[PDB]
mmCIF file of C-alpha atoms in Angstrom:
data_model
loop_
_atom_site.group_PDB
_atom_site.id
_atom_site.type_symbol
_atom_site.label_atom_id
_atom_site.label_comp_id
_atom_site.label_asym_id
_atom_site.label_seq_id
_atom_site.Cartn_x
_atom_site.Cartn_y
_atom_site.Cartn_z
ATOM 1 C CA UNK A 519 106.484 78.492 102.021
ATOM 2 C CA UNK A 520 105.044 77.993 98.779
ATOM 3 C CA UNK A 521 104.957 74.729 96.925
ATOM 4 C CA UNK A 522 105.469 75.966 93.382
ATOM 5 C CA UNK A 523 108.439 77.347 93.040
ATOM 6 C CA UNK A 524 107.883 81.664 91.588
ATOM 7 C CA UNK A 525 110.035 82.226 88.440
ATOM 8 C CA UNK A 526 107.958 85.491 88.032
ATOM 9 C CA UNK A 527 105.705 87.187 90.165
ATOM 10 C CA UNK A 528 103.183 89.881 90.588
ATOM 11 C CA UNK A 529 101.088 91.575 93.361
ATOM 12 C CA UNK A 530 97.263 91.622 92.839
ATOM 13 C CA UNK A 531 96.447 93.291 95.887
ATOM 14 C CA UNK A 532 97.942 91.083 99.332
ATOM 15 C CA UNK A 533 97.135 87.649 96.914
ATOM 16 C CA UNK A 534 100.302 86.999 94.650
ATOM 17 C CA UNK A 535 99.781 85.601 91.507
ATOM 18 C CA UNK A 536 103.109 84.462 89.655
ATOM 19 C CA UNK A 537 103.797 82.378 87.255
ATOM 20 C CA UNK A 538 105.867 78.742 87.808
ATOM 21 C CA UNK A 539 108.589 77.122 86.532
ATOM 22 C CA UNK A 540 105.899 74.443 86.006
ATOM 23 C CA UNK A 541 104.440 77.290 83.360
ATOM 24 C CA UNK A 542 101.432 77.005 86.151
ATOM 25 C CA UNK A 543 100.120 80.537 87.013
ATOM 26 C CA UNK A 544 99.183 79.713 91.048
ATOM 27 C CA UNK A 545 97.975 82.209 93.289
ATOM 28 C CA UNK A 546 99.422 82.282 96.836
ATOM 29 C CA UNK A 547 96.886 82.807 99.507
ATOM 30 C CA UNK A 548 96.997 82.441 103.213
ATOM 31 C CA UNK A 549 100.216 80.509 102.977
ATOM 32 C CA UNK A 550 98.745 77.887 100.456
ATOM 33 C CA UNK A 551 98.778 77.852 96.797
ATOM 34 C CA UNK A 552 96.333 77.363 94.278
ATOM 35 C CA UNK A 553 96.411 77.101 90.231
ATOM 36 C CA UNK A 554 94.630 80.029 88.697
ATOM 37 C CA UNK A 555 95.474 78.750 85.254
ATOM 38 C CA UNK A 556 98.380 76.616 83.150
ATOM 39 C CA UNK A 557 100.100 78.276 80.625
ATOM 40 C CA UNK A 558 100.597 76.020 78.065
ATOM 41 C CA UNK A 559 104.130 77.858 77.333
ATOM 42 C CA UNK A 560 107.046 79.838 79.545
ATOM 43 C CA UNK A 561 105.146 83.450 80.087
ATOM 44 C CA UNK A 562 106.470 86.180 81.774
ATOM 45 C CA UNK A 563 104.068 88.712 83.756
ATOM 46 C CA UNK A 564 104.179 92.459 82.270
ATOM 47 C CA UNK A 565 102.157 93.774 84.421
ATOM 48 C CA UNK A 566 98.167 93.985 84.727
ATOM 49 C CA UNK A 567 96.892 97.015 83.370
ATOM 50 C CA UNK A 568 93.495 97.575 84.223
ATOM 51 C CA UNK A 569 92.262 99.416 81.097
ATOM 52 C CA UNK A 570 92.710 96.020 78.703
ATOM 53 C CA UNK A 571 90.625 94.060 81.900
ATOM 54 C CA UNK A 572 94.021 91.850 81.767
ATOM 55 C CA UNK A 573 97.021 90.589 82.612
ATOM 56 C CA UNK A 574 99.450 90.787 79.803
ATOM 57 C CA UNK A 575 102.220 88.285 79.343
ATOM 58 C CA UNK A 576 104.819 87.873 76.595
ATOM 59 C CA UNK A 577 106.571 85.058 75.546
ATOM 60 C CA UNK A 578 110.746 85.042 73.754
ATOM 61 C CA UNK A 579 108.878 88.099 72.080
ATOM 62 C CA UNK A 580 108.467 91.857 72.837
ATOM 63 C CA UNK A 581 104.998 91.605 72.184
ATOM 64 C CA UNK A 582 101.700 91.042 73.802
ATOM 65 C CA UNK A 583 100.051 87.769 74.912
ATOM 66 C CA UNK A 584 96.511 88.361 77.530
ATOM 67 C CA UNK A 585 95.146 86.325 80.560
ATOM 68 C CA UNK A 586 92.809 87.400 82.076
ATOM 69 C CA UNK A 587 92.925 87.095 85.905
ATOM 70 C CA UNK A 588 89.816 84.476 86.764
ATOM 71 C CA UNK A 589 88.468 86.567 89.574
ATOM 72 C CA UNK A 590 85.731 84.751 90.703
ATOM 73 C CA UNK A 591 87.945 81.749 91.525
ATOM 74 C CA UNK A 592 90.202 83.929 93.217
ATOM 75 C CA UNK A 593 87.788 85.689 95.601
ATOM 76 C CA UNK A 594 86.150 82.062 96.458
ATOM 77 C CA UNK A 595 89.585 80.322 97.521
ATOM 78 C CA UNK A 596 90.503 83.826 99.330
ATOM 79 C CA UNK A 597 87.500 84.104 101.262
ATOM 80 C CA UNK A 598 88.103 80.304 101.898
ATOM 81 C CA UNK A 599 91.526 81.850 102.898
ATOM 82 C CA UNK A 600 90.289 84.423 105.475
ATOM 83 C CA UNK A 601 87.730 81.742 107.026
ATOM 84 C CA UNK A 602 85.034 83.081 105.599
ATOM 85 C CA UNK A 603 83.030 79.872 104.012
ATOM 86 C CA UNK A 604 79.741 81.762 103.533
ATOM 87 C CA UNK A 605 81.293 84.407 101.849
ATOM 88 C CA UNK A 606 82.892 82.291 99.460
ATOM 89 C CA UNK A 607 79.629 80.442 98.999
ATOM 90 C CA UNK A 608 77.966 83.263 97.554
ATOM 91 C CA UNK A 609 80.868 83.698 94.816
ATOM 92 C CA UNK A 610 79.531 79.710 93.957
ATOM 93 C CA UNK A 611 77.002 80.679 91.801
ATOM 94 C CA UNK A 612 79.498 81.614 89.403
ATOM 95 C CA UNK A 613 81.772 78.535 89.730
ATOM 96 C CA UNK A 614 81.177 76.074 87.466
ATOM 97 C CA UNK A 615 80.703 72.238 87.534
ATOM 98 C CA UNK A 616 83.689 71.058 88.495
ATOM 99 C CA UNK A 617 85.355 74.115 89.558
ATOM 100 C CA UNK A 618 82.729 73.884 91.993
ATOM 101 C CA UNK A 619 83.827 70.748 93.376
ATOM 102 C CA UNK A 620 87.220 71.890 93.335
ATOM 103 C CA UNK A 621 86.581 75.439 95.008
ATOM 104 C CA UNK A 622 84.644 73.162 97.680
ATOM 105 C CA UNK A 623 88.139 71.215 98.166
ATOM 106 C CA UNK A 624 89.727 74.202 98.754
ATOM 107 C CA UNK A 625 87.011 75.164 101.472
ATOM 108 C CA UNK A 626 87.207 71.614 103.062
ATOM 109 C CA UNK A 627 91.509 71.919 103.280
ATOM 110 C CA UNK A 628 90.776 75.127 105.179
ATOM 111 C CA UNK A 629 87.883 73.366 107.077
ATOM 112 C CA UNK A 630 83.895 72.964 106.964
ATOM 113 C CA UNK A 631 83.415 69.487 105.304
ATOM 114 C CA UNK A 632 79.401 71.036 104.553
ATOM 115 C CA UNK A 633 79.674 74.266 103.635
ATOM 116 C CA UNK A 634 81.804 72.616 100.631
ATOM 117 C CA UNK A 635 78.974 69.689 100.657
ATOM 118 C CA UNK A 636 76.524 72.602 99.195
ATOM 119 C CA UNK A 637 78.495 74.167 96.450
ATOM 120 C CA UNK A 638 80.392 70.653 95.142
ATOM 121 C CA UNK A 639 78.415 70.036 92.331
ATOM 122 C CA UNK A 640 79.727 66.642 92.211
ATOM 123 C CA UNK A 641 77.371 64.474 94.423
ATOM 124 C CA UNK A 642 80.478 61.748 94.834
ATOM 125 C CA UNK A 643 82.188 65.227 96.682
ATOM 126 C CA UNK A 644 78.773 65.673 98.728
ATOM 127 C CA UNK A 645 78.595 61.950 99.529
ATOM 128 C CA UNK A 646 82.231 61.696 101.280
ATOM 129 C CA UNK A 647 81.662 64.671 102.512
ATOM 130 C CA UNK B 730 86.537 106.670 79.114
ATOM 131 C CA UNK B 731 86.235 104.937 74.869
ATOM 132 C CA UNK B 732 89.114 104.547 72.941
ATOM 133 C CA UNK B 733 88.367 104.824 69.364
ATOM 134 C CA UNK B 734 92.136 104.869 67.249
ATOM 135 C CA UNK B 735 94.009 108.052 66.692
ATOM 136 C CA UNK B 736 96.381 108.537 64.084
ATOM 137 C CA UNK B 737 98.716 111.312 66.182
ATOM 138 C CA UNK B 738 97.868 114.690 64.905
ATOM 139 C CA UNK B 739 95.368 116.813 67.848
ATOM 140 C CA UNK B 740 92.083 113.736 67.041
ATOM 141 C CA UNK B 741 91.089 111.443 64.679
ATOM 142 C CA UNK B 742 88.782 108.706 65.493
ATOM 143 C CA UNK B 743 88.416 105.106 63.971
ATOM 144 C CA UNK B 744 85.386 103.203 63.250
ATOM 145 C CA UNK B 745 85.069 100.878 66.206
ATOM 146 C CA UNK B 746 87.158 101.225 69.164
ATOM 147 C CA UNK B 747 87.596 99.220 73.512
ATOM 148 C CA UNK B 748 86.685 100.851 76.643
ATOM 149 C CA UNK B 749 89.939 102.054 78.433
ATOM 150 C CA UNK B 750 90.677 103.387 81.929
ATOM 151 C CA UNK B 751 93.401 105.178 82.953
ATOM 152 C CA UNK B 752 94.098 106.180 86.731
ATOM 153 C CA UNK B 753 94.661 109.166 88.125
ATOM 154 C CA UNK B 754 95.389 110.542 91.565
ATOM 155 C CA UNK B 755 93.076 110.996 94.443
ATOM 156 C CA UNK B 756 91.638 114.496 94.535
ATOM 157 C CA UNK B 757 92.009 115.893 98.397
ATOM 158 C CA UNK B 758 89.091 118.504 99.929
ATOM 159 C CA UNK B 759 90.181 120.813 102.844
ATOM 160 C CA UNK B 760 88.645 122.741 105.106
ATOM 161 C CA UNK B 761 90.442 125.572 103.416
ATOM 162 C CA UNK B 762 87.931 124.834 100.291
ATOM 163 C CA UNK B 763 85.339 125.395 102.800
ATOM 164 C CA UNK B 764 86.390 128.506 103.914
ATOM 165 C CA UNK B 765 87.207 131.978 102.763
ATOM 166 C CA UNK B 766 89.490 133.700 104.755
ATOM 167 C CA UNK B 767 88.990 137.190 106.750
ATOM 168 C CA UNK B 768 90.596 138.881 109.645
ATOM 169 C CA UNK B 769 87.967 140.984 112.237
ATOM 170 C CA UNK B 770 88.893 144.178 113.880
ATOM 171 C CA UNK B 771 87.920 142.838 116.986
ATOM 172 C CA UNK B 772 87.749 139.009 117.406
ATOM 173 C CA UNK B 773 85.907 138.976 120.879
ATOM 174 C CA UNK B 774 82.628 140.061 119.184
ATOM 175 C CA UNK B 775 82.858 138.162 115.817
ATOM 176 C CA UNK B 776 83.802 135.277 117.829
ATOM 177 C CA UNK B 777 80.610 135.713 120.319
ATOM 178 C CA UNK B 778 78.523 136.698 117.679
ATOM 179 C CA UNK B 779 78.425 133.746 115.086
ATOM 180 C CA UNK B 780 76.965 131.666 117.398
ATOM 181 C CA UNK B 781 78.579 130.226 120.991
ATOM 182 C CA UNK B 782 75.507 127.521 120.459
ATOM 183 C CA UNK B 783 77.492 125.095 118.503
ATOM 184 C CA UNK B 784 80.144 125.754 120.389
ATOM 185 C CA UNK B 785 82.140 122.791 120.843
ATOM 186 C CA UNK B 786 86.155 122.887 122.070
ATOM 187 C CA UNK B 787 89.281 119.954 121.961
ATOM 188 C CA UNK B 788 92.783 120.177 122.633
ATOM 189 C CA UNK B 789 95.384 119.022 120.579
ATOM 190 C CA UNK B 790 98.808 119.107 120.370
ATOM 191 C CA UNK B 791 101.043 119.581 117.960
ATOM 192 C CA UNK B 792 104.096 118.214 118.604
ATOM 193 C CA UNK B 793 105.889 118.751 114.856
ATOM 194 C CA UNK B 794 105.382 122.555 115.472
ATOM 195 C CA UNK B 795 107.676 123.863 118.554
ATOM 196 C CA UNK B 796 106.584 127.768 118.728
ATOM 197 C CA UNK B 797 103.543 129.604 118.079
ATOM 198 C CA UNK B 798 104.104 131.114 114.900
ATOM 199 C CA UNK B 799 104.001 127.744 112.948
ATOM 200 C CA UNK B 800 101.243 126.693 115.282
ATOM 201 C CA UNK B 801 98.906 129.996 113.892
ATOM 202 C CA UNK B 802 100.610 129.250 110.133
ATOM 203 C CA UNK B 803 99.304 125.696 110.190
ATOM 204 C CA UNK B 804 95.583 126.005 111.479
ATOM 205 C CA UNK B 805 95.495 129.437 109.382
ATOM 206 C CA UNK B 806 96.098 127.013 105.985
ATOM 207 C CA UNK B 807 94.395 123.611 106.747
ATOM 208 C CA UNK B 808 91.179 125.455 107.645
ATOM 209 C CA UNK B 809 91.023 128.301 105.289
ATOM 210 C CA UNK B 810 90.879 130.757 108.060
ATOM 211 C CA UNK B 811 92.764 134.097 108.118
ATOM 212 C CA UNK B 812 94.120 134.254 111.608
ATOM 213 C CA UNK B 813 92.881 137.986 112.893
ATOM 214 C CA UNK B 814 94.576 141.001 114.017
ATOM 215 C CA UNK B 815 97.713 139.306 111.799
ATOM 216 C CA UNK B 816 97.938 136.948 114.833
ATOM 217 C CA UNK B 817 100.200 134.300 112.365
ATOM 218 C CA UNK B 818 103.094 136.756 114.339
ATOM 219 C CA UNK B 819 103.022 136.210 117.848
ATOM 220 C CA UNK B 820 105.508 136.901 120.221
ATOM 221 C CA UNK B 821 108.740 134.318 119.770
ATOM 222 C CA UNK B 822 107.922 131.374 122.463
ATOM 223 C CA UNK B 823 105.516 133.257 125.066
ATOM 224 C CA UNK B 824 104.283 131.223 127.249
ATOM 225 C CA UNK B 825 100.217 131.931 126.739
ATOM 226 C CA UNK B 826 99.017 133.147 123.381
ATOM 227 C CA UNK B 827 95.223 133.814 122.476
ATOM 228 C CA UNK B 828 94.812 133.478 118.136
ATOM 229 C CA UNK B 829 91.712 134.774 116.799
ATOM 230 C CA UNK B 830 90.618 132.977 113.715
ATOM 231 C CA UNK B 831 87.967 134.226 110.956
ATOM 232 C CA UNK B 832 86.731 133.489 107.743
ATOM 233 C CA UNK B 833 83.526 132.162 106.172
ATOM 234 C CA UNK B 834 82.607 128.881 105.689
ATOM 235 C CA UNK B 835 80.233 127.785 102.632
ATOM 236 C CA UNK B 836 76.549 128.129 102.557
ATOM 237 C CA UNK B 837 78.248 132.097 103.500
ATOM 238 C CA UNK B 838 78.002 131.282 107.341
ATOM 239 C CA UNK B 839 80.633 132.882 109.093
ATOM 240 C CA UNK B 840 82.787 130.425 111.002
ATOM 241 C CA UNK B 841 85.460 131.381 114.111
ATOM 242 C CA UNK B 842 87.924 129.800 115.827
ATOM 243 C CA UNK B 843 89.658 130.433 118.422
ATOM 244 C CA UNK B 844 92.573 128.523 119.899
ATOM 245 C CA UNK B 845 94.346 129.597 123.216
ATOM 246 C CA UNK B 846 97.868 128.398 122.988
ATOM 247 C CA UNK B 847 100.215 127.177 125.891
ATOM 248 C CA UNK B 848 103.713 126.805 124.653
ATOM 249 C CA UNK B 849 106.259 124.346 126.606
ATOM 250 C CA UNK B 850 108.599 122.917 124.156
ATOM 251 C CA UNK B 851 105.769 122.055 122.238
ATOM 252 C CA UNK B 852 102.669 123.658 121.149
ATOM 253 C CA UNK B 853 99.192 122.966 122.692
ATOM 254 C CA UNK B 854 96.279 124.576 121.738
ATOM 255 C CA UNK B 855 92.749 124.357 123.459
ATOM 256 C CA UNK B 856 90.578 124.881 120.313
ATOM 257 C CA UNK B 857 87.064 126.651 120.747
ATOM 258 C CA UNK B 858 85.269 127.001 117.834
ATOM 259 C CA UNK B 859 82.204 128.874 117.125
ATOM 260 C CA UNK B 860 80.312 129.039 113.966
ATOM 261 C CA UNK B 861 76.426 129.291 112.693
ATOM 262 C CA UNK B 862 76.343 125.974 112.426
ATOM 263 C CA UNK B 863 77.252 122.726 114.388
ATOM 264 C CA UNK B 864 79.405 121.576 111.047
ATOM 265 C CA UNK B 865 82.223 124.362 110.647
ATOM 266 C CA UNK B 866 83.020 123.755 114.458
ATOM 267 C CA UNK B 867 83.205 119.699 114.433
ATOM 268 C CA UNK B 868 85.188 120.289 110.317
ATOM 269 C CA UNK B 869 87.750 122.715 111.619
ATOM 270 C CA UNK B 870 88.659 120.538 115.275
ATOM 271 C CA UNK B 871 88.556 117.343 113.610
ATOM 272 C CA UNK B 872 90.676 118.817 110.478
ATOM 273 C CA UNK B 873 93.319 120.598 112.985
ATOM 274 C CA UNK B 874 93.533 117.642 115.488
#
């Protein structure tokens, strides 16, 4: 059971991403859920269509609005997910700075207090760790 | 595929356009693509002949079909094998029922199969195939069963 609550939803392969009533976009995987992104605004999920390389919202209006699914964050907390640490490592090139040290906090709520010591780019992260 | 902008008419491009995809359905490959059927005037031979060298036989049942005529109908299709003699009519539920399969496979190398058929309330089939080659034999008993 998921701790933010799905006004709208969508299946991107098994992961769900949906959108909150929080206007938080969150990602359910393995029973957990993550933030993707924060909408600043109440969005509704069209659909993803695959030719645009989006996601495309709208808002009160009939028109178009684009987020882009953040992929890379995605396959690092999934692989986190599946207990697969290493694999999730080699997505951490491609992580940035803090997102590092955040993706790392993901790995460490799953388990491996080190493997998340390497890619936490904070050295605070590394030294509790 | 690129998108440039298109003003309906039949084409019409614009200046600067995105790259677009657009999906489409998977695109299935049967044996039957592989083959070319052909019935033989005498199986026995054909069936010898091609080359009993690759030979290589499995049983299978198939349990959806409940007589021999559907049984001949269904390997006849999937494999793109004419079954010989106009064995597709065989007689209504004998017990024992020898079907003679022919056609060519690609490269033009002749590929047989034969498949002796034991009817109980369900079809059976001990599948023998011969061919010039050790790939029409393995294609057709791993495509039937």
């Amino acid at each position: 059971e998921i701790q933010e609550i799905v006004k709208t939803g969508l299946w991107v392969g098994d992961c769900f991403i949906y959108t909150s009533s929080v206007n938080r976009l969150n990602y359910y995987v393995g029973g957990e859920i993550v933030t993707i992104a924060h909408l600043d605004r109440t969005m509704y999920l069209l659909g993803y269509i695959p030719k645009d390389n989006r996601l495309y919202l709208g808002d009160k209006e009939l028109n178009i609005v684009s987020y882009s699914l953040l992929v890379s964050v995605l396959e690092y907390q999934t692989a986190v997910m599946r207990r697969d640490f290493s694999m999730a490592d080699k997505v951490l090139p491609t992580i940035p700075k803090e997102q590092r040290t955040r993706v790392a906090h993901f790995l460490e709520k799953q388990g491996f207090k080190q493997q998340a010591l390497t890619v936490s780019t904070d050295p605070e992260h590394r030294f509790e760790l | 595929f690129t998108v440039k902008d298109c003003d309906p008419n039949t084409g019409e491009i614009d200046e600067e356009g995105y790259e677009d995809e657009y999906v489409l359905e998977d695109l299935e490959v049967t044996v039957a693509d592989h083959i070319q059927k052909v019935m033989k005037v005498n199986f026995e031979a054909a069936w010898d002949e091609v080359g009993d060298e690759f030979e290589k036989e499995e049983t299978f049942t198939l349990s959806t079909i409940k007589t021999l005529e559907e049984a001949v109908g269904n390997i006849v299709k999937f494999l793109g094998m004419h079954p010989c003699e106009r064995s597709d009519k065989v007689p209504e539920n004998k017990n024992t029922h020898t079907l003679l399969l022919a056609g060519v496979f690609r490269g033009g190398h002749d590929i047989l199969v034969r498949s002796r058929l034991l009817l109980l309330d369900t079809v059976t089939m001990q599948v023998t195939a011969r061919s010039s080659e050790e790939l029409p034999v393995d294609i057709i008993l791993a495509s039937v069963g």
